[PDB]
Amino acid sequence: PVIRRAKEIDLYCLNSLMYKLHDEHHQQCPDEKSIARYLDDPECMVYVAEMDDVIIGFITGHFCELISTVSKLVMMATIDELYIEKEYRREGVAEQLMMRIEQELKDYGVKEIFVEVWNKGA
């Protein structure tokens, strides 16, 4: 699967996979900002896994800053969502997605990373 930065051309697909993600969420533990606006945000990231010509997965994350009144801002980030087609799981597509987002994160000097997928940090 080819991992790449998302584009305005995938917004249509993303609505569906974003829906599939949230759907399954309400099915395990039944108990925001647009994906488009999200994609356009200069501090946001969205990578997708493309198999043939279809997007079978994506991951979403955003840069953030710990702001104080006595210290310079510290660069940090947050991994928000991650989804894989039930037909493509158990294939390492998640790692190649987590691998990509960390690449951009690392070279952006992020000090701390909070994962929101599914409470783990780094």
Add this chain to the structure above:
Amino acid sequence: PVIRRAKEIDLYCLNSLMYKLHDEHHQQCPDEKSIARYLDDPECMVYVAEMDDVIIGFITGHFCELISTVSKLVMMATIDELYIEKEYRREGVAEQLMMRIEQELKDYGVKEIFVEVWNKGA
């Protein structure tokens, strides 16, 4: 030892203990903002351990906010410094200081805590 919030009246003592702290630091691994201004900052905290009528210890911490462009600010904090007279260590004065700062932290709804004393978080 009585733990309490510092006052403008301890700034004099603090300069000395702040110096003792930094001094010992340069002695193990030889390889900022005023304590007064720090004390006056509405987002800052400084507690001291008073034995008889002398301050034998203090701890310092500040509130901070993880700011993003796609999420409301998350309340977090940082524990900066902590010092105990070499004559009063091994007496649990540190715990009663860490205990105090966490009290105010907890009731201030802090989500994450970064300890800078001495890399551990919470």
